[PDB]
Write a protein that binds this ligand. Structure first.
Ligand SMILES: NC(=O)c1ccc[n+]([C@@H]2O[C@H](COP(=O)([O-])OP(=O)(O)OC[C@H]3O[C@@H](n4cnc5c(N)ncnc54)[C@H](OP(=O)(O)O)[C@@H]3O)[C@@H](O)[C@H]2O)c1
Length: 316
């Protein structure tokens, strides 16, 4: 297992990164500092997480401390849905760059294919629960993303939560200048994503797996929901290999040629989670973990199920 995967922009991306959704602003600076100290070189961020300033304090201190050089870090952020119009993309990117203390991103993703009405609220509502859409489509927002590459603000651009028809729409765009480098999607043993992974990889698009541990701290968790970290079949595979359940859940996507971005703010788990380059799951283990698919999603964007570009009606 090599540490980096080659992207279609010619750059290499670390296959293990640190997630930051739900990392409290008063804890995420130390989380990122610890992560860089123990070997992480990839941080996954987003404006909608409301903690980029604090992530940036950590990055900037480790660069100032010469723990790491900027060229060795791979920092990812995401354009939120209320910024899909052409005239707002650059300012959104630049706000994220300012917050993160950076003069470029390694990768900037369209966070969801659904555009929302611009304004202060991240989920604008009409009077009844519905999300108020934007009329700007995925292809004009993609052109605005391409402009960021050509202005030097981002090294690579990509997409997140796009279904295969939507990836295809991008790939078929008239006048396409840059293909997406990455599609970041939910992926774990309960949502194994064979069809969409197969499609993206066949096109040279790298897939990043989010919520690899099943997001036990997701806000809408219900007790009845399945739980990867407590699944006795996964605990048995981990015991066989003398690893933790989380380590198995992180190694699983790595062996599918995916990038994976487990989140923690706990120093011991941050270090734990990185110690996954030292064992291998068998093919039998991999097929066994794949067999647990339940099409179960952490992130179903439930307020947006009537949006024209809602991604999860489609089989994949
Ligand atoms: N593109 C998108 O739309 C999107 C959507 C969702 C997620 N993401 C990205 O993917 C990242 C990861 O997904 P996620 O945050 O949903 O969840 P996750 O990484 O599946 O799980 C995070 C949860 O697992 C706990 N945890 C971490 N390591 C552990 C270990 N070794 N043992 C036991 N528990 C452990 C964390 O607790 P502590 O933090 O308290 O240690 C936290 O409660 C996000 O943070 C974000 O960067 C992107």
């Amino acid at each position: 297992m090599a540490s980096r995967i080659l992207l279609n922009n010619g750059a290499k991306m670390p296959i293990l990164g640190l997630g930051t959704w739900k990392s409290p602003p008063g804890q995420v600076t130390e989380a990122v500092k610890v992560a860089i100290d123990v070997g992480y070189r990839h941080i996954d961020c987003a404006h909608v997480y409301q903690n980029e300033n604090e992530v940036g304090v950590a990055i900037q201190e480790k660069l100032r401390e010469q723990v790491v050089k900027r060229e060795e870090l791979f920092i990812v952020s995401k354009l939120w849905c209320t910024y899909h119009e052409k005239g707002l993309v650059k300012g959104a990117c630049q706000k994220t760059l300012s917050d993160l203390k950076l003069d470029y991103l390694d990768l900037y993703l369209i966070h969801w294919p659904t555009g929302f009405k611009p304004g202060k609220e991240f989920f604008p509502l009409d009077e009844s629960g519905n999300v108020v859409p934007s009329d700007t489509n995925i292809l004009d927002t993609w052109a605005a993303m391409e402009e960021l590459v050509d202005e030097g603000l981002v090294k690579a651009i990509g997409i997140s939560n796009f279904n295969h028809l939507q990836v295809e729409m991008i790939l078929n765009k008239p006048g396409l200048k840059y293909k997406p480098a990455v599609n970041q999607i939910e992926c774990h043993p309960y949502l194994t994503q064979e069809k969409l992974i197969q499609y993206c990889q066949s096109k040279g698009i790298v897939v990043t797996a989010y919520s690899p541990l099943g997001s036990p701290d997701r806000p809408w968790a219900k007790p009845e929901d399945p739980s990867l970290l407590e699944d006795p079949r996964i605990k048995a595979i981990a015991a066989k290999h003398n690893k933790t359940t989380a380590q198995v859940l992180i190694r699983f996507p790595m062996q599918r040629n995916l990038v994976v971005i487990p989140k923690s703010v706990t120093p011991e788990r941050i270090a734990e989670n990185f110690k996954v380059f030292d064992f291998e799951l068998s093919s039998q283990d991999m097929t066994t973990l794949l067999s647990y698919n339940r099409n179960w999603r952490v992130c179903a964007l439930l307020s947006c199920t009537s949006h024209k570009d809602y991604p999860f009606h489609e089989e994949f």
